[PDB]
Amino acid sequence: GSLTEDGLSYKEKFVVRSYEVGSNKTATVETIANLLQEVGCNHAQSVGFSTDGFATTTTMRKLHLIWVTARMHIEIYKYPAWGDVVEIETWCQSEGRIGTRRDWILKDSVTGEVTGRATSKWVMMNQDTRRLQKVSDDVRDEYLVFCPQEPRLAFPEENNRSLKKIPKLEDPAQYSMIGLKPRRADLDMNQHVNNVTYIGWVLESIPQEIVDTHELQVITLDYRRECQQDDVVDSLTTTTSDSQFLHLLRLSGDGQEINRGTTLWRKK
Amino acid sequence: GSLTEDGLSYKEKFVVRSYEVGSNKTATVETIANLLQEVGCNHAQSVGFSTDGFATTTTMRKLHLIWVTARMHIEIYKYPAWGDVVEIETWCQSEGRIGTRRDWILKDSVTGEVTGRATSKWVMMNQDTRRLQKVSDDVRDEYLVFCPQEPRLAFPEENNRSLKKIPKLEDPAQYSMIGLKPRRADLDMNQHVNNVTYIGWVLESIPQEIVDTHELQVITLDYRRECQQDDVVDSLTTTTSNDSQFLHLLRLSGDGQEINRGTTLWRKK
Ligand SMILES: Nc1ccc2oc(=O)ccc2c1
Ligand SMILES: Nc1ccc2oc(=O)ccc2c1
């Protein structure tokens, strides 16, 4: 991979692996989400930020501040097959005092056609107290020279799906998968649950018949609180409709919300 | 990746990814085991066998026969760090009528040093009845031209760890992790649990204090029966031992049917 000519975005190619594909012989959405994290990490490394997934500055490090994902939105038009080469381009852009955004564009390396798009919203948090805070002018000014100055959005369209508010699923859920728990493979280098694991957990409560007859086109996931290494999660889903679903992940005991989301599926 | 000059082995390089590393900033043993499967699959593709992980011939496909893993043995001297390039070489060799063997050697691409090695034993099974059978002379003769004709072993030493018999853990286990179940990410393209998931499940019952103070050097795992997509597994471990050694058992949560047994060897950091 490498920074592009202008130094304001990063590109990397990946060859889809045998164990990365699902029943359609194409990459799963969790494989795509892991590749988006990998290219984001390589971009932060190339310009001197931390490589732990938080992309912090030296000033954020003294204040014990990190960036944490608030929302992930992914739209896939075509999943790459085993052995195919996919090129992913990524960039960031600050969003005032609210937080920051990392966007991605996925292309088929042979045709050059856009096969998918993603956008993520991040907020600043103290790593110890877990308290959110608005971004200071000093921190935002430090990142400006690593981002495009004019707006550059993976989802430019008006009233597009990526910014829609997600409601809270009401009990009883139509479908559920209970007692989900992370294993060591679900943890990152800092022993926290990888953000992609929550996408897997949301998808566990979609009935197998939908997975067998449809393809996932869009997923929007809000992150509210972490699942700790010793927590247990219930995944709930209700049809709201293409087939569309509303999702909720909550801690198995007390029912504390950890994530909410929506998915849109196209019949094969 | 590519077949080597003589066409009897396959090599492929991999750059270690951010999400593939553990608490030491080096690749986990499950990441290494997934790379071993990937290079095995690319080798089978390059010479015309199936690419579903079973590496079958046309004759095997007619008889509804597949190769299934009976044992996996991995020894790691150094785990590659994030961003490092590791080169893996793999080859197969038939083992008479018993089954076949796939071996691997892992090297650091910059130094050329051997950083690990692995060997796996496979048996032939009818896909539908799940009945094992000996390998016919016709099938073994079909694979001979794709293997070295003189012995080539990743573990040549006498009485080496890779061929040792593993005993059955007796209750009560010293440690356990109960109620493990696969999710869709644990399944392969044919909706079966990926062999690497069982390595993860064995390791779940090792106490966190061992993982925090030791490095896994050797793992030997026997595969007896599959975990189905709707099954639930219990992982049991007992210390048998500077090095720490453990005996492992995976069994179905309800009736206690054995699915795997294994041993691990760990060295203090
Ligand atoms: N606001 C902001 C935050 C994190 C960033 O990390 C990068 O790797 C490049 C740009 C960037 C911008
Ligand atoms: N006996 C045996 C079985 C499977 C094999 O698959 C390969 O990809 C190359 C050689 C080989 C040999």
UniProtKB/Swiss-Prot annotation, chain B:
- Explain the purpose of this protein: Plays an essential role in chain termination during de novo fatty acid synthesis. Possesses high thioesterase activity for oleoyl-ACP versus other acyl-ACPs. Substrate preference is 18:1 > 18:0 > 16:1.
Gene source species: Arabidopsis thaliana
Give the protein name, as stated in the record: Oleoyl-acyl carrier protein thioesterase 1, chloroplastic
What's an example GO BP annotation here? fatty acid biosynthetic process
One example GO MF annotation: fatty acyl-[ACP] hydrolase activity
**What is annotated as the active site?**
190, 192, 227
A GO cellular-component term linked to this record: chloroplast
Sorted UniProt keywords: Chloroplast, Fatty acid biosynthesis, Fatty acid metabolism, Hydrolase, Lipid biosynthesis, Lipid metabolism, Plastid, Transit peptide
Q: Which reaction does it catalyse?
A: (9Z)-octadecenoyl-[ACP] + H2O = (9Z)-octadecenoate + holo-[ACP] + H(+)
Q: Report the EC code(s) recorded for this entry.
A: 3.1.2.14
**Highest taxon, organism lineage:** Eukaryota
Q: Which residues form a coiled coil?
A: none
Q: Which family does it belong to?
A: Belongs to the acyl-ACP thioesterase family.
Q: Which residues form the signal peptide?
A: none
Top enzyme class, one word, equals hydrolase
Q: Major location, coarse class?
A: plastid
The listed locations are:
Plastid, Chloroplast
Span of the entire protein shown here: 75 to 359 of 362
